[PDB]
């Protein structure tokens, strides 16, 4: 039995920046009140995990990363009512406490219970459930899914269809939802509109899917890696261009391709140069630009306010505007009904033990999404 | 008669920056096809005209400024069909050609025929109708209203109720429409929301009026000049604050007064610091900040994209988002129908020949709007 007891299992621990993960033997404390301990089944490799490794995203170390996943509830702490042992679930990197100003506001989703703005690397009560070799290990985004077992706050856990193919839907835990929603919830792409998507990783490609579903007439995919183009077109890109092929700035090229600029531009990479280009490429009077990629720590853009005064709308969001706990299940039901597929996004499958190899592929540009199995 | 002939009249010419205006005899050529010659009756003094004087906004010189006004049609060139001699009309600093991409888009108003983005100081055909001392004189925003007679493009002239009090309705040509519309069309203030308004000039007080109309439960007026607070309250502000009274940055004060920041913030001054503070005071997850004020030439804001990634919406606009030709007449009709008064905004009245005195008043801070009568 394991309920009420400390769990000993394997987890991928990051001891320091710019080093490989080390698969360690770790101890996982039982769930406290309003906490859920989950046996992990599958985890997707997202660039945000990698940002911590590269030092581009700050969070307290040592730590167990991982936030895009699906598992089975092993046990629940006292007070828990939304999930029970055996349920299939998806941890949410941005919770939905349902009690703060944001959660009450129908237009926002950045729950105040988050651990993104100023990471503590703990659960909501401010403590850690992880220990390894006599040392406490930090949580990441309240989820830490690069571990056979993890403890997450209830409001950061969603119950999903029991028949769910956990090795597929784990992408709904982050990449798909974020990309797709940035188009449908955040930007609010209108039918017959023109869009531009910067970055064709699992998130950017989902953004491409979102634009198509919203009914865009033109979806121009932009990426410096041409091997991402077939998938982009497969998912709805009407055009694919590579900035490296041109002599003039990419924003000028884009504007000249769309009568002054696209209606909706999305930055889905995490760089300042492309965030700028993306803003500059949407029409100065009727364009909307959405920041989706996480920028490098404290890096600042330099913009002339005039760019906005003409009529531009510049926004950003996490999770594609989806209120995590309510949105994830609906999205899974949609997947189950075949409204959309994630096959094209899953390029590689590897056992959790080969996690480092999973990151190598991300670094190589050969993978879109590598799903790890436990 | 003057029809078909060159008009000799008085006009306020600016031959160089940071110098007073020069009331001189100027010649006004007859209107070309699709152009409208107007006998000016009243013009409000807007900070945008002053920007040119101070060097803060560049436009070719010599020039005749003036863009917030109301007059009577003297004559129309061939092809003109929307106005006739004797009609009361309001010139528009942003046109509504009705045929370009922007005009066709229901949600945009920055017509491509504008002369703001990259000033030529001419009418839409690239030439000028003014001459003075044997030399041509430039137009400003296609209106040039600091003149007894001015010629404007038809799509930049709106016909209004024949019983309209021109000495009041003139404000509807810029400041009132911009400020009010910024709240009602650009920000789309929701009932029961919280707002912050930086700048309590004629445009800012109009923003306050806009927020009240939209049903804001809370409207915080921000200004370093406490003499504006009486009018702010009179116009709808629930509280007024002067940054000079605090040790902490204003955005921090604003956030702490409003549970993490207001739902809507407006910058109606034209400064980087206030523009930054304004963006920072809207709630990180559900706030919207709108740029109304025009920033000094080529100055840039340094911004961390993370301010947007949490959920903030940053936007700007001209004319309060109103499609000028359709919008202005309806606002005049609302005024006629007593829906809103403009008396609180007009604090001084002077004849056109004392234009320099009205600007002195603007600089001194003793006036909201000074109206010049011809
Ligand atoms: N807002 C959110 O909630 C949220 C959620 C998930 C991920 N993200 C962020 O999304 C971003 C992308 O995520 P991913 O997992 O899909 O990343 P990814 O690395 O798999 O793919 C990004 C793409 O950008 C392309 N690219 C890189 N540099 C380029 C450049 N200079 N110009 C043009 N293209 C270039 C790459 O070739 C790659 O195809 C990351 O920054 C991640 O942090 C945000
Ligand atoms: N977007 C547009 O279409 C549009 C239209 C009209 C005017 N504008 C611009 O809007 C802005 C305001 O116009 P106005 O005519 O009402 O100007 P104004 O000079 O009369 O009013 C500015 C107000 O802001 C206050 N203020 C100045 N500096 C401040 C500071 N550092 N901190 C706090 N408060 C400060 C001033 O005391 C004054 O009360 C200007 O930039 C003008 O060019 C834009
Ligand atoms: Zn992610
Ligand atoms: Zn919440
Ligand atoms: Zn137009
Ligand atoms: Zn003005």
From Swiss-Prot, chains A, B:
One GO cellular component term noted in the UniProt record for this chain: plasma membrane
Location of this chain's protein in the cell: Cytoplasm
Catalytic activity: all-trans-retinol + NAD(+) = all-trans-retinal + NADH + H(+); all-trans-4-hydroxyretinol + NAD(+) = all-trans-4-hydroxyretinal + NADH + H(+); all-trans-4-oxoretinol + NAD(+) = all-trans-4-oxoretinal + NADH + H(+)
Co-factor binding details: Binds 2 Zn(2+) ions per subunit.
PROSITE patterns: ADH_ZINC (PS00059)
Names of required cofactors: Zn(2+)
Gene Ontology terms describing biological process: retinoic acid metabolic process; retinoid metabolic process; retinol metabolic process
N-acetylserine: residues carrying this PTM: 1
Primary localization class, coarse: cytoplasm
Subunit field text: Dimer of identical or non-identical chains of three types; alpha, beta and gamma.
Keywords from the named record: Acetylation, Cytoplasm, Lipid metabolism, Metal-binding, NAD, Oxidoreductase, Phosphoprotein, Zinc
Positions bound to Zn(2+) 2: 97, 100, 103, 111
Residues with PTM Phosphotyrosine: 34
Protein name per its UniProtKB record: All-trans-retinol dehydrogenase [NAD(+)] ADH1B
Function recorded in the entry: Catalyzes the NAD-dependent oxidation of all-trans-retinol and its derivatives such as all-trans-4-hydroxyretinol and may participate in retinoid metabolism. In vitro can also catalyze the NADH-dependent reduction of all-trans-retinal and its derivatives such as all-trans-4-oxoretinal. Catalyzes in the oxidative direction with higher efficiency. Has the same affinity for all-trans-4-hydroxyretinol and all-trans-4-oxoretinal.
SMART domains to which the protein is assigned, alphabetical: PKS_ER
Known EC number: 1.1.1.105
Family assignment from sequence similarity: Belongs to the zinc-containing alcohol dehydrogenase family.
Gene3D superfamilies: Medium-chain alcohol dehydrogenases, catalytic domain, NAD(P)-binding Rossmann-like Domain
Binding site for NAD(+): 199-204, 223, 228, 292-294, 369
Further details from the record: There are 7 different ADH's isozymes in human: three belongs to class-I: alpha, beta, and gamma, one to class-II: pi, one to class-III: chi, one to class-IV: ADH7 and one to class-V: ADH6.
Native organism taxonomy: Eukaryota, Metazoa, Chordata, Craniata, Vertebrata
